[PDB]
Amino acid sequence: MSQLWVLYETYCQLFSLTEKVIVIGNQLEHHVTVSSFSFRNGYIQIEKKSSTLAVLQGGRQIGELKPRCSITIDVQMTIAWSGEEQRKYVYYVGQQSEVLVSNDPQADIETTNARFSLRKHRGQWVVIPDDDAPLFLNGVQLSDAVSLRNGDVLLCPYMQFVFIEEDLLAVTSSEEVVSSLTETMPPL
C-alpha cells in the first residue's frame, strides 16, 4: 500500500494511492473530503512523480513528500506519506496482560511514532493514550482510555494496529517494527 494520512482538527483520514493526481478539498467528489475547511487558498493537489509526491496548493508547488515524510499547511492540516511499501507483522499476545508502545528501552513495540499502552481486562483490551503522542481510533483522536472491539483500528502517522482476535495483534508500518513480542509469522 501507498497511503496518505490527512490530519486536521481531531481527525485523521487514511487514503490509498492505488489514480495519479488526487485532490483534497471540501466537496464530496474530491478524493479526500474535509468539509469543515474553506480551501480559499486552493484545494490541495497531490500528484505522483515516477519516488516522490508533488504537493501543490493553487496549482503551484509548496512541497514534495518523500516516503515517511509529512507536510503541514495553512488553510492547519498535516499530510504525511508512507512511501510506496508497507509491511505487516502479527504478534501472539494471548499470554500478555499489557503491551507498551513507545520509545522507551523496555517497550514491547519500539517506535518514535506513537506512545500508548494496551491493557487486558477480563478478556478485553483497553487503549490508554499518552497526553503527548496523538493517536486515532477509527479516525478520531483519543482523549482518554477506551475499551476496544475487534477491527477497531488504531492509527498514528505511519503505523496501524489492529486486533485480529483477542490474542493476535497486527501492526502495519512503513519501517521494520522492533518488538519483544512473539511473532506468529514471518513479516508480510
Author numbering: 1 to 18, 21 to 52, 55 to 79, 83 to 195
The authors write:
The membrane-bound protein EssC is an integral component of the bacterial Type VII secretion system (T7SS), which is a determinant of virulence in important Gram-positive pathogens. We present crystal structures of the N-terminal FHA domains (EssC-N) and a C-terminal fragment EssC-C from Geobacillus thermodenitrificans, encompassing two of the ATPase-type modules, D2 and D3.
EssC-N consists of residues Met1–Leu195 folded into a two-domain structure with each domain representative of the β-sandwich FHA fold. FHA1 and FHA2 domains consist of nine and 12 β-strands respectively with the domains aligned almost perpendicular to each other. A pronounced feature at the domain–domain interface is Trp5 nestled into a cavity formed by Leu162, Pro164 and Tyr165. Hydrogen-bonding interactions also contribute to the domain alignments, with a network of three glutamines (residues 3, 93, and 167) and a water molecule interacting at one end of the interface. Seven residues are missing from the model of FHA1 due to insufficient electron density. These residues (at positions 19, 20, 53, 54, 80, 81 and 82) are located on turns linking β-strands. However, as reported by Tanaka et al., motifs common to many FHA domains and residues implicated in the recognition and binding of phosphothreonine, as exemplified by Ki67 are absent from EssC-N.
